[PDB]
Amino acid sequence: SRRYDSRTTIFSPEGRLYQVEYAMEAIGHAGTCLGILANDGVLLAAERRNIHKLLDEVFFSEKIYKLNEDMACSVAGITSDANVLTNELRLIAQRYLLQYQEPIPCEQLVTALCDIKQAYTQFGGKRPFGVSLLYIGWDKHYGFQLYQSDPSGNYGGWKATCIGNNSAAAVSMLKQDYKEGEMTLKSALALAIKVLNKTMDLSAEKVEIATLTRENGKTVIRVLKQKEVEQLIKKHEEEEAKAEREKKEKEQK
Amino acid sequence: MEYLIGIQGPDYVLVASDRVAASNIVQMKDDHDKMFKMSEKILLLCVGEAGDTVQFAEYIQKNVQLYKMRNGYELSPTAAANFTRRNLADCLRSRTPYHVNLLLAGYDEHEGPALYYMDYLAALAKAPFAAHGYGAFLTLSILDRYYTPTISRERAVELLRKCLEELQKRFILNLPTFSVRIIDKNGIHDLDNISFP
Amino acid sequence: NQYDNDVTVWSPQGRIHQIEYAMEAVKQGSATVGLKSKTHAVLVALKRAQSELAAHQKKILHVDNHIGISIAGLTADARLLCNFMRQECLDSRFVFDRPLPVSRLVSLIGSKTQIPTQRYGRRPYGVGLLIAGYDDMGPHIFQTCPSANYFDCRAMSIGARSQSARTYLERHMSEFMECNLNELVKHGLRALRETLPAEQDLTTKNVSIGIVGKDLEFTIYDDDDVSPFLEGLEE
Amino acid sequence: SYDRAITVFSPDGHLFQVEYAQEAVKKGSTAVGVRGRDIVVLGVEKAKLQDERTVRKICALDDNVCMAFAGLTADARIVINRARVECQSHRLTVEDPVTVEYITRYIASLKQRYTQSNGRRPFGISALIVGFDFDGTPRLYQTDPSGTYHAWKANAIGRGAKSVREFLEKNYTDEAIETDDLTIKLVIKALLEVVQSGGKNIELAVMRRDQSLKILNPEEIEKYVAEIEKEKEE
Amino acid sequence: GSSAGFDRHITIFSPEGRLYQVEYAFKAINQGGLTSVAVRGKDCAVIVTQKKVPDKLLDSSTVTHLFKITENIGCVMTGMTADSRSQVQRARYEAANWKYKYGYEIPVDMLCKRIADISQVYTQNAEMRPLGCCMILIGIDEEQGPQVYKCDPAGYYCGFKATAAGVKQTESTSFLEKKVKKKFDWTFEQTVETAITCLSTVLSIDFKPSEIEVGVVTVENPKFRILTEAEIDAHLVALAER
Amino acid sequence: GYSFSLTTFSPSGKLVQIEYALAAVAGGAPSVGIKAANGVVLATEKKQKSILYDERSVHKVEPITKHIGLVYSGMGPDYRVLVHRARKLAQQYYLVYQEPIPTAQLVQRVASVMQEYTQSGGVRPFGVSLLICGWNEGRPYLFQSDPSGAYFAWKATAMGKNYVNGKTFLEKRYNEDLELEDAIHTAILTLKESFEGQMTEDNIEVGICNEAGFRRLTPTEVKDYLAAI
Amino acid sequence: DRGVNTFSPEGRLFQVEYAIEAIKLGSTAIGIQTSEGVCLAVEKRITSPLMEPSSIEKIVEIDAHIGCAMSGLIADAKTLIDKARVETQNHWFTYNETMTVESVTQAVSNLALQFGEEDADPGAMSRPFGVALLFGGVDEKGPQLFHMDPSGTFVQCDARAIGSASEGAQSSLQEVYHKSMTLKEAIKSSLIILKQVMEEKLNATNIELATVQPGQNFHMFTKEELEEVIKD
Amino acid sequence: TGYDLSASTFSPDGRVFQVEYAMKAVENSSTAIGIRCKDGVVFGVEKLVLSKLYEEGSNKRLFNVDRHVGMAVAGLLADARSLADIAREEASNFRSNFGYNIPLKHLADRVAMYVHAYTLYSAVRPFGCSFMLGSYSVNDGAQLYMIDPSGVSYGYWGCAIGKARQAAKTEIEKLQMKEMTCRDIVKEVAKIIYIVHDEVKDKAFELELSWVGELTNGRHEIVPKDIREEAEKYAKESLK
Ligand code: NA
């Protein structure tokens, strides 16, 4: 029935896909999610929206999903839509490995899921997936990689990017302090804590960090412990205190 | 009834195949080529039933070429050998099983040279040397006797010639000429055909 | 207006406006006349030419050796419905080795054309037919409409200004059963002429004739073949 | 299955969904194609934190054919992978490789189908397809959301395609084609009409007769930009 | 009473979280003008409903709201007549299919749950409307004794001591909850009479044997039995002596 | 069928049909879940409109398998759909792995079904939030699954009428080291905060889950707990 | 927003009415039937000098004895042209003979109202074709010219003009067409009427001309041939 | 209005307007009557002639649905014929499955459920038709059923559908049909049709008569021309 049909996969007079744009609006409300690429690794730092005294910690993380032996991802949007997509990312990765007996090269896994998101915007009459994803991984072709994908099924590779709440503010803050080719996982962790401190309102229980490194020819994916996060957060407070001394004393002399 | 042979050295893979295309009691072609280029550094040597061999080899070749076009890089010899195995194994219990016996020879920047043997059942084996056809029954023991893992390409061609001479001597089928190619860090190199008067 | 765009929507008056709009397609097309005697079924049609340089649109179609039709409405729908009739006739000769009784073919048209009038997104056939046939029950003139309804007729006229033709047919229907073929065709041509304005008359360019009877298979007369029939009267 | 008619005729005889897909093309980055004597050139308008490789708008379809696009990039990826599958499927069914016209005809019919089939909206991209047929003739073709295609000597699609097309109409001469280096400069000259800075914001790729697609690095593009300023003052 | 978009036309939530189309289906039950009562006893379960035959031209034997689903399960339907016969037909199919797959007579609660489950689909899928009808089933359970079950156009279902449907549902349930609160034996006669007197007091009508229809199941005779004009008259004349 | 989604994004990026489904849950009868150190309690207000309702005919606290149980707030008929599907999903897992389904695995599979009804053609979302309890790794599990298809592991929580106040009462009255018997007392106390009238063993329903599996408390056991107040 | 198979109160499908309107935006084409052959002539409407005029194909060969002139949405016509070409070759395969000009016109006309939403295959037509066709060729009935519109109505024409300036060109054809006119006279009249209605000044690149004669196969005029005919 | 475009939509007061609008098409149609007597069922239809150009017998509103079953319709005629085909196929299916003639109550229940199915969705529209089914068997007796656009099926002694449904009903009530025969009832049927026919408004009409009873051997057939002419002359003379 045409009366009840929402017309989700049609164009607007300015060549615009409104359901896609409205899905992007939802992503803005989800927790801040950032990714930083370094020479010795790549990381995901995300704002935790499941913060409540009566919540129970049953899972390893809240927004970090291991996809394959060399890849992991983080999401921003409708968390049930993210569970659908992350499950499919795992199936695509297993299908590639069954076929070639090699892990799926990072970009290929991204394009595969993006083609599914794209289909949802061209045909079917269904609403799009209200999710933006950040992918971290390693492969024998391009090494450490960071990717970003949108409800449109659009993607790009990045050195540092942000999705979710205050994304633009975090991206411009990354644009200033990211030094191409001269980033180590130690300096990227400090930049992740610096950016999140400003784009949020900072306890280790409201944040979630994961790193992807190479150790002895094997990929290591680890979500940092709550104590480890307090240490990076504390060092950031001890850098802001030292910065206030190099402004009040560097004006007199 | 057709012959395939591969000898893998320290930094190369030497391959050869007969040049006969036959029908019933007649040699229809004396210059037929049984090798298929998949990538710049991979050859698929294919043998078996009349229709199946070219249909199967070409389908794999075009899908390997499709991978290169979609991603900007080529499949490794291992990934190509496993992709070939997956297709052959998927057709095995289907309406359309392909009766093809093959060898995949390749060079990878990281893994080095590789030789894979595959039978029509889709069993896949990595081998220092291998042969397909009735000829393998007369030549496998020659390779067992003379092959060493450090065999130079110069010595490998002498060993290949020893195998091809045995076929001229003892094999009841004609097989007078053989295509010869070698793969290394610089791709696929055509060598002179082995010919017998 | 809101009960206007779908065949599945009944208006508050118990009317299906989409069926009534499809009926209009018949009224817009040129007039066609169908009439019968005890031995012959005759179809006469006014062929419309888009210009002096264009030919006059085929109004009369062959269905089987014993059946022929005259169309009024969307020509693509007329072709679709004609092809359906031809196939139903072919199946009858293949299975039973006997011509399909004309009244049974008309029933199939009624069932077939009713289906789209009750399903969403579907539409009525925008075509009306006059069907001339001959079987064990003698000659017949049947009428089919976009509404899926069908009529057994003594004579009939459909299309633009067809009420004029119906007035003539209602007057002379007493004569029709005893007419000889020439007298019957003449009556059909006079009824067709009534639809035409006082300026123009029936020519051997805008006249099509279809005849089936006891001794005649369905035959279509169009240009020079129409001349013997057009020599009978002058307004 | 979703069987709604998306692209339908409007009272004036317009296919609004196809016209709305052309609006999305008009917002895309300017893509320029020039067909020379022994070379064909594609140039596309251009975030420091972005990996340039993952977002290039000049793709290879086969060894002899490549293309550029303007509009919705996700839509483009679908069109590109279908063209790539078709090139191999063509080699498999008939042996010989695809001509620039054969694959342009395939892409154009795919686009047209998406303007007349239920449940689908048109592809919001326009393409510039260039290459060399087996006989060696250089080719340039352009497809648009409707499914129409034409051959061109030179052309532009996307943002400011009007002003870049007019520039090319005046600067496409036999003297400008004479050398492989001159045709490359013509794409740069034209791209400088819309791209405010130039060089830093230009993606350029060339295809010579028996050579495969060659992407020019930023230092190479800077060299040709410097040569234009010498011609400009002399 | 907030509305947004198509929430009054199709089965989608309104801003308060209601299903207006389901609410309208409950109003469709009353459109028939009739009221039904079902009472459970110590050893029985009885159903009673108004038998409005306003035309002598009708064959009164075909005018009924009581239906036999299985030998031991009977029901009374309230609401839209064709919707009700459709639901009875479905109930008959589901019951027969249950015995074919499981090798035992379907329990009354299971048949009611199944009909309620089918009804819930109409409540969640937009292309079709809920049925504007209400099903009340009765039967003797081998282990649980007599049972009275009711299901909704909403997909809800429940077991009851006594229940009602139709125009005077609210009035009949108030009557029944006062009568059930007093200590009674609940014999067959008491259960038939409470059902007849609930309908009579609520409609303010002194019934005639042709103005009501009664269906019953007992521990002694579990087969669903429909009462004749003579058997109904016996209960009406016994109630007159009080 | 209607092949288009009935749930779509509003210009402000909201899935308004899921927000309206959550309003149906918010209007539903209260439900409480408390994960004690040695078990889990599920309690609900099973209040009926009349005395004529046979209380023991239908249940709100339902078993899924031998070790998993459920409760809800919102639409009763929608709930039954999810119970049937959850029982089915738990049997499929058992046929394949020959081991009782982990609570988190069942919650994830049922949450997927719920997500489908927010994107699939011609359907509205479920107007139900579930509270699933279980025992599998020698430890207890309590999860909430809401109409969008999102799930949360809880130490204690409330749903339905007066849920925001129930959660504050639980926040101050909950301790990680409470024992199952004490947690049943606390669960009935959370319901008593929003209960209108006198609380009997016939207008409330309790289910427990420990090493011995999931089971409903009999009205006699509920009476003994209500005696303590 | 109504469906694609909705009738207007006048008894016409709206979608078909609008597809006819879409042809009023196509470049004008003319066809003239003569006892010596049929000629087809069309304006290319070239938007830019950089565009290759040889790549604008508005007159195509269906078979050696049949040609087709098109106007309206040209991408829509490409589907009908190929279906016509396939039908001729399927007919040749089965019957070992050529099709009549009328049979080919009818074959393409059978696809006309084959659009709709409900009760259709996965990717069936969602709207009519916004094309008008002029089929011109020779068969056993001699030279014949046929017209076709989005409604599927096909008819034989002695002279027909389709496109943006079809009203004006048909007036000129009506005043100039004589049944006994020669092929040379029909070709010139077509070029005169086309020059008249055309925005640009007509030359050997701006237009397309083709002839099908009894004794000659379908012939597309070359630049040298077009220039030699432009002279008069 | 608003709530009246789809059969899958209830109005706020619990009504399905598309079904009520389908019933209006039946009410706007000519009158048909059916009367069950001691030895069978008799049908009569007021068949208005829209044109003198039509043959006598054209647009029949009485059908043979099975050898022992007759059908009388009122409303949209294409919908009515479609329902006759459904009833025919249903009766044929019963014989294939069980080997004997379909009992009329069962045929009515089966056909009424197809009718009902068209009152639940937006994908299809309700039938603009009301029809009666008449039969005669030795084991079942005389049986008359009537189905309306909603899907309702009831058994009747006397029945009328169309324009003058209530006018024909008060005339049928004047008959003690339970003790009358088909031969006497035909005269009564023709008479009631002549009374309810509006000569001014609906100019001319053709009386259609059908019957199935002990006289016909339980076969549904047309009332022979002679009996029809006697009932037609009797109807005109009683009108004076
Ligand atoms: Na519904």
Coordinates of N, CA, C and O in Angstrom, one line a residue, chain B residues 79-166:
Chain B
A79 N 47.1 -18.5 -1.7 CA 45.7 -18.1 -1.8 C 45.1 -18.6 -3.1 O 43.9 -19.0 -3.1
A80 N 45.8 -18.5 -4.2 CA 45.4 -19.0 -5.5 C 45.2 -20.5 -5.6 O 44.2 -21.0 -6.1
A81 N 46.1 -21.2 -5.0 CA 46.0 -22.7 -4.9 C 44.8 -23.1 -4.0 O 44.1 -24.1 -4.4
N82 N 44.5 -22.4 -2.9 CA 43.4 -22.7 -2.1 C 42.1 -22.3 -2.7 O 41.1 -23.0 -2.5
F83 N 42.1 -21.2 -3.4 CA 40.9 -20.7 -4.1 C 40.6 -21.8 -5.2 O 39.4 -22.1 -5.4
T84 N 41.6 -22.3 -6.0 CA 41.4 -23.3 -7.0 C 40.8 -24.6 -6.3 O 39.9 -25.2 -6.9
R85 N 41.4 -25.0 -5.2 CA 40.9 -26.2 -4.4 C 39.5 -26.0 -4.0 O 38.7 -27.0 -4.1
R86 N 39.1 -24.8 -3.5 CA 37.7 -24.6 -3.0 C 36.7 -24.8 -4.2 O 35.7 -25.5 -4.0
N87 N 37.0 -24.2 -5.4 CA 36.1 -24.4 -6.5 C 36.0 -25.9 -6.9 O 34.9 -26.4 -7.2
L88 N 37.1 -26.6 -7.0 CA 37.2 -28.0 -7.5 C 36.4 -28.9 -6.5 O 35.7 -29.7 -6.9
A89 N 36.6 -28.6 -5.2 CA 36.0 -29.4 -4.1 C 34.5 -29.1 -4.1 O 33.7 -30.0 -3.8
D90 N 34.0 -27.9 -4.3 CA 32.6 -27.5 -4.4 C 31.9 -28.1 -5.5 O 30.7 -28.5 -5.3
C91 N 32.5 -28.4 -6.6 CA 31.9 -29.1 -7.8 C 31.9 -30.6 -7.6 O 31.2 -31.3 -8.4
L92 N 32.8 -31.2 -6.8 CA 33.0 -32.6 -6.6 C 31.6 -33.3 -6.4 O 31.4 -34.3 -7.0
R93 N 30.8 -32.9 -5.4 CA 29.5 -33.6 -5.1 C 28.3 -33.0 -5.9 O 27.2 -33.2 -5.5
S94 N 28.6 -32.1 -6.8 CA 27.6 -31.4 -7.6 C 27.2 -32.1 -8.9 O 27.8 -33.2 -9.2
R95 N 26.3 -31.6 -9.7 CA 25.9 -32.1 -11.0 C 27.1 -32.0 -12.0 O 27.3 -32.9 -12.8
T96 N 27.9 -30.9 -11.9 CA 29.0 -30.6 -12.8 C 30.5 -30.8 -12.1 O 31.2 -29.8 -11.9
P97 N 30.9 -32.1 -11.9 CA 32.3 -32.3 -11.4 C 33.3 -32.2 -12.5 O 33.1 -32.7 -13.6
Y98 N 34.4 -31.4 -12.3 CA 35.4 -31.3 -13.3 C 36.5 -32.4 -13.2 O 37.0 -32.5 -12.1
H99 N 36.8 -33.1 -14.2 CA 37.8 -34.1 -14.2 C 39.2 -33.5 -14.6 O 39.6 -33.7 -15.8
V100 N 39.8 -32.8 -13.7 CA 41.0 -32.1 -14.0 C 42.1 -32.4 -13.0 O 41.8 -32.5 -11.8
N101 N 43.3 -32.6 -13.4 CA 44.4 -32.9 -12.5 C 45.3 -31.7 -12.8 O 45.6 -31.4 -14.0
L102 N 45.9 -31.0 -11.8 CA 46.6 -29.8 -12.0 C 47.8 -29.6 -11.1 O 48.0 -30.3 -10.1
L103 N 48.7 -28.7 -11.5 CA 49.9 -28.2 -10.7 C 49.8 -26.7 -10.7 O 49.5 -26.1 -11.7
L104 N 50.0 -26.0 -9.5 CA 50.1 -24.6 -9.5 C 51.5 -24.2 -9.0 O 52.0 -24.8 -8.0
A105 N 52.2 -23.5 -9.8 CA 53.6 -23.1 -9.5 C 53.5 -21.5 -9.3 O 52.9 -20.8 -10.1
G106 N 54.2 -21.1 -8.3 CA 54.2 -19.6 -8.0 C 55.4 -19.2 -7.3 O 56.2 -20.0 -6.8
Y107 N 55.5 -17.8 -7.2 CA 56.6 -17.1 -6.5 C 55.9 -16.0 -5.6 O 55.2 -15.2 -6.2
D108 N 56.2 -16.0 -4.3 CA 55.7 -15.0 -3.5 C 56.9 -14.2 -2.9 O 57.9 -14.9 -2.5
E109 N 56.8 -12.9 -2.8 CA 57.8 -12.0 -2.2 C 58.3 -12.5 -0.8 O 59.5 -12.4 -0.5
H110 N 57.3 -12.9 0.0 CA 57.5 -13.3 1.4 C 57.8 -14.7 1.6 O 58.7 -15.1 2.3
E111 N 57.0 -15.6 1.0 CA 57.1 -17.0 1.2 C 58.1 -17.8 0.2 O 58.5 -18.9 0.5
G112 N 58.5 -17.1 -0.8 CA 59.4 -17.7 -1.8 C 58.7 -18.6 -2.9 O 57.5 -18.4 -3.1
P113 N 59.4 -19.5 -3.5 CA 58.8 -20.4 -4.5 C 57.9 -21.5 -4.0 O 58.2 -22.0 -2.9
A114 N 56.9 -21.9 -4.7 CA 56.0 -22.9 -4.3 C 55.4 -23.8 -5.4 O 55.1 -23.2 -6.5
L115 N 55.3 -25.1 -5.2 CA 54.7 -26.0 -6.1 C 53.6 -26.8 -5.5 O 53.8 -27.5 -4.5
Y116 N 52.4 -26.7 -6.0 CA 51.2 -27.4 -5.5 C 50.7 -28.4 -6.4 O 50.5 -28.2 -7.6
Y117 N 50.4 -29.6 -5.9 CA 49.8 -30.7 -6.6 C 48.3 -30.8 -6.2 O 48.0 -30.7 -5.0
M118 N 47.5 -31.0 -7.2 CA 46.0 -31.2 -7.0 C 45.5 -32.2 -7.9 O 45.8 -32.2 -9.1
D119 N 44.8 -33.2 -7.4 CA 44.1 -34.2 -8.2 C 42.6 -33.9 -8.4 O 42.1 -33.0 -7.7
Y120 N 41.9 -34.6 -9.3 CA 40.5 -34.3 -9.6 C 39.6 -34.3 -8.4 O 38.4 -33.8 -8.5
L121 N 40.0 -35.0 -7.3 CA 39.2 -35.1 -6.1 C 39.3 -33.8 -5.3 O 38.6 -33.6 -4.3
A122 N 40.3 -32.9 -5.6 CA 40.6 -31.6 -4.9 C 41.5 -31.8 -3.7 O 41.4 -30.9 -2.8
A123 N 42.3 -32.8 -3.6 CA 43.3 -32.9 -2.5 C 44.4 -32.0 -2.9 O 44.8 -31.9 -4.1
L124 N 44.9 -31.2 -1.9 CA 46.0 -30.2 -2.2 C 47.2 -30.5 -1.4 O 47.1 -30.7 -0.2
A125 N 48.3 -30.6 -2.1 CA 49.6 -30.9 -1.5 C 50.7 -30.0 -1.9 O 50.8 -29.7 -3.1
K126 N 51.6 -29.5 -1.0 CA 52.7 -28.7 -1.3 C 53.9 -29.7 -1.6 O 54.1 -30.6 -0.7
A127 N 54.6 -29.6 -2.7 CA 55.6 -30.5 -3.0 C 56.9 -29.9 -3.5 O 56.9 -28.8 -4.1
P128 N 58.1 -30.5 -3.1 CA 59.4 -30.0 -3.7 C 59.4 -30.3 -5.2 O 59.9 -29.5 -6.0
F129 N 58.8 -31.4 -5.6 CA 58.7 -31.7 -7.0 C 57.4 -32.6 -7.2 O 57.0 -33.3 -6.3
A130 N 56.8 -32.6 -8.4 CA 55.6 -33.4 -8.6 C 55.4 -33.7 -10.1 O 56.0 -32.9 -11.0
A131 N 54.6 -34.7 -10.5 CA 54.3 -35.0 -11.9 C 52.9 -35.6 -12.0 O 52.4 -36.3 -11.1
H132 N 52.2 -35.3 -13.1 CA 50.9 -35.8 -13.4 C 50.9 -36.7 -14.7 O 51.6 -36.4 -15.6
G133 N 50.0 -37.6 -14.7 CA 49.8 -38.5 -15.9 C 50.5 -39.9 -15.7 O 51.2 -40.1 -14.7
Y134 N 50.4 -40.8 -16.7 CA 51.1 -42.1 -16.7 C 52.6 -41.9 -16.6 O 53.3 -42.7 -16.1
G135 N 53.1 -40.8 -17.2 CA 54.5 -40.4 -17.3 C 55.1 -40.3 -15.9 O 56.3 -40.6 -15.7
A136 N 54.3 -39.9 -14.9 CA 54.8 -39.7 -13.5 C 55.2 -41.1 -12.9 O 56.1 -41.1 -12.1
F137 N 54.7 -42.2 -13.4 CA 55.1 -43.5 -12.9 C 56.5 -43.9 -13.4 O 57.2 -44.6 -12.7
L138 N 56.9 -43.3 -14.5 CA 58.3 -43.5 -15.0 C 59.3 -42.5 -14.6 O 60.5 -42.7 -14.7
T139 N 58.9 -41.3 -14.2 CA 59.8 -40.2 -13.9 C 59.9 -39.8 -12.4 O 60.8 -39.1 -12.0
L140 N 58.9 -40.2 -11.5 CA 59.0 -39.8 -10.1 C 60.2 -40.4 -9.4 O 60.8 -39.7 -8.5
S141 N 60.6 -41.6 -9.7 CA 61.8 -42.2 -9.1 C 63.1 -41.5 -9.6 O 64.1 -41.5 -8.9
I142 N 63.1 -40.9 -10.8 CA 64.2 -40.2 -11.3 C 64.4 -38.9 -10.4 O 65.5 -38.6 -10.0
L143 N 63.3 -38.2 -10.1 CA 63.4 -37.1 -9.3 C 63.7 -37.5 -7.8 O 64.4 -36.7 -7.1
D144 N 63.2 -38.6 -7.3 CA 63.6 -39.1 -6.0 C 65.1 -39.3 -5.9 O 65.7 -38.8 -4.9
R145 N 65.7 -39.9 -6.9 CA 67.1 -40.2 -7.0 C 68.0 -39.0 -7.1 O 69.0 -38.9 -6.4
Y146 N 67.7 -38.0 -8.0 CA 68.5 -36.9 -8.3 C 68.2 -35.6 -7.6 O 69.1 -34.7 -7.4
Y147 N 66.9 -35.3 -7.2 CA 66.6 -34.0 -6.5 C 67.2 -33.8 -5.1 O 67.2 -34.8 -4.3
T148 N 67.7 -32.6 -4.9 CA 68.2 -32.1 -3.6 C 67.6 -30.7 -3.5 O 67.4 -30.0 -4.5
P149 N 67.2 -30.3 -2.2 CA 66.6 -29.0 -2.1 C 67.3 -27.8 -2.6 O 66.7 -26.7 -2.9
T150 N 68.6 -27.9 -2.7 CA 69.5 -26.8 -3.2 C 69.8 -26.8 -4.7 O 70.7 -26.1 -5.2
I151 N 69.0 -27.6 -5.5 CA 69.2 -27.8 -6.9 C 69.1 -26.5 -7.7 O 68.2 -25.7 -7.5
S152 N 70.2 -26.1 -8.4 CA 70.2 -24.9 -9.2 C 69.3 -25.0 -10.4 O 69.0 -26.1 -10.9
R153 N 68.9 -23.9 -11.0 CA 68.0 -24.0 -12.2 C 68.7 -24.7 -13.4 O 68.0 -25.4 -14.1
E154 N 70.0 -24.5 -13.5 CA 70.8 -25.2 -14.5 C 70.7 -26.7 -14.4 O 70.5 -27.4 -15.3
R155 N 70.9 -27.2 -13.1 CA 70.8 -28.6 -12.8 C 69.3 -29.1 -12.9 O 69.1 -30.3 -13.3
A156 N 68.3 -28.3 -12.6 CA 66.9 -28.6 -12.6 C 66.5 -28.9 -14.0 O 65.7 -29.8 -14.2
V157 N 67.0 -28.1 -15.0 CA 66.7 -28.4 -16.4 C 67.4 -29.7 -16.9 O 66.8 -30.4 -17.7
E158 N 68.5 -30.0 -16.3 CA 69.2 -31.3 -16.7 C 68.4 -32.5 -16.2 O 68.1 -33.4 -16.9
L159 N 67.9 -32.3 -14.9 CA 67.0 -33.3 -14.3 C 65.7 -33.5 -15.1 O 65.2 -34.6 -15.4
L160 N 65.1 -32.3 -15.5 CA 63.9 -32.3 -16.3 C 64.1 -33.1 -17.6 O 63.3 -33.9 -18.0
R161 N 65.3 -32.8 -18.2 CA 65.6 -33.5 -19.5 C 65.8 -35.0 -19.3 O 65.4 -35.8 -20.1
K162 N 66.3 -35.4 -18.1 CA 66.5 -36.8 -17.8 C 65.1 -37.5 -17.7 O 65.0 -38.7 -18.1
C163 N 64.1 -36.8 -17.2 CA 62.7 -37.3 -17.0 C 62.1 -37.4 -18.4 O 61.5 -38.4 -18.7
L164 N 62.2 -36.3 -19.2 CA 61.6 -36.3 -20.5 C 62.3 -37.3 -21.5 O 61.6 -37.9 -22.3
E165 N 63.6 -37.7 -21.2 CA 64.3 -38.7 -22.0 C 63.7 -40.1 -21.7 O 63.6 -40.9 -22.6
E166 N 63.4 -40.3 -20.4 CA 62.8 -41.6 -20.0 C 61.5 -41.8 -20.7 O 61.2 -42.9 -21.1

